[PDB]
Design an enzyme around this catalytic site. Structure first.
Site, PDB file in Angstrom:
ATOM      1  N   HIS A  12       0.739  -1.264   0.000  1.00 40.24           N
ATOM      2  CA  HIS A  12       0.000   0.000   0.000  1.00 40.24           C
ATOM      3  C   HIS A  12       0.770   1.318   0.000  1.00 40.24           C
ATOM      4  CE1 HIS A  12      -3.589  -2.374   0.649  1.00 40.24           C
ATOM      5  NE2 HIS A  12      -3.049  -2.931   1.718  1.00 40.24           N
ATOM      6  N   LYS A  41      -5.236 -10.268  -7.449  1.00 45.53           N
ATOM      7  CA  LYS A  41      -5.895  -9.630  -6.311  1.00 45.53           C
ATOM      8  C   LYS A  41      -6.939  -8.703  -6.959  1.00 45.53           C
ATOM      9  CE  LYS A  41      -4.917  -7.368  -1.911  1.00 45.53           C
ATOM     10  NZ  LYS A  41      -4.214  -6.229  -1.251  1.00 45.53           N
ATOM     11  N   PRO A  42      -8.216  -8.819  -6.564  1.00 44.72           N
ATOM     12  CA  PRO A  42      -9.295  -8.001  -7.138  1.00 44.72           C
ATOM     13  C   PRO A  42      -9.226  -6.489  -6.938  1.00 44.72           C
ATOM     14  CG  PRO A  42     -10.108  -9.224  -5.250  1.00 44.72           C
ATOM     15  CD  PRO A  42      -8.707  -9.689  -5.478  1.00 44.72           C
ATOM     16  N   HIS A 119      -3.047  -3.108   7.922  1.00 42.66           N
ATOM     17  CA  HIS A 119      -4.171  -3.412   7.049  1.00 42.66           C
ATOM     18  C   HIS A 119      -4.846  -2.129   6.573  1.00 42.66           C
ATOM     19  CE1 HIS A 119      -8.230  -4.679   5.866  1.00 42.66           C
ATOM     20  NE2 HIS A 119      -8.722  -4.002   6.888  1.00 42.66           N
ATOM     21  N   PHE A 120      -5.173  -2.091   5.287  1.00 41.66           N
ATOM     22  CA  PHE A 120      -5.864  -0.951   4.707  1.00 41.66           C
ATOM     23  C   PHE A 120      -7.339  -1.331   4.701  1.00 41.66           C
ATOM     24  CE2 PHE A 120      -5.598   2.989   2.389  1.00 41.66           C
ATOM     25  CZ  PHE A 120      -6.822   3.047   1.764  1.00 41.66           C
ATOM     26  N   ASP A 121      -8.139  -0.612   5.479  1.00 40.10           N
ATOM     27  CA  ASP A 121      -9.557  -0.925   5.595  1.00 40.10           C
ATOM     28  C   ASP A 121     -10.455  -0.234   4.572  1.00 40.10           C
ATOM     29  OD1 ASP A 121     -11.409  -2.485   7.390  1.00 40.10           O
ATOM     30  OD2 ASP A 121     -12.349  -0.511   7.551  1.00 40.10           O
TER      31      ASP A 121
END
Length: 124
Positions: A12, A41-42, A119-121
């Site tokens: 990210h 990865k979508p 984590h990117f939420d």
């Protein structure tokens, strides 16, 4: 193995550019960062800010993540981001993405000591 904090940087962070400069940015970055190695990865988001400014978000506004966890934080200010979303012509191993550039607040989950993003939420 690769730590969660290191994986967050690899998946990210793009402090080397201020914004996506062409429609091929996502196709090149998703491949370069090894996010299309096993499967396409979508969706993924890259943040165009200094690592220090993103890490500082863990000390800003506490909010519940999409899944209910309470270790998520939203940035006070907006940041330059690029959203990558798989297109209809994407077919492994030739994954294809649509590049969208925008300025939004980011929400990340934080863990550890030092307390850093893992984590990117979401972007709001």
């Amino acid at each position: 193995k690769e730590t969660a904090a290191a994986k967050f940087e690899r998946q990210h962070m793009d402090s080397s550019t201020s914004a996506a400069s062409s429609s091929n940015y996502c196709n090149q970055m998703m491949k370069s960062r090894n996010l299309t190695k096993d499967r396409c990865k979508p969706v993924n988001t890259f943040v165009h800010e200094s690592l220090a400014d993103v890490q500082a978000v863990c000390s800003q506004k506490n909010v519940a993540c999409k899944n209910g966890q309470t270790n998520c934080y939203q940035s006070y200010s907006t940041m330059s981001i690029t959203d990558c979303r798989e297109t209809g012509s994407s077919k492994y191993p030739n994954c294809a993405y649509k590049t969208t550039q925008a300025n939004k607040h980011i929400i990340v989950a934080c863990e550890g000591n030092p307390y850093v993003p893992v984590h990117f939420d979401a972007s709001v």
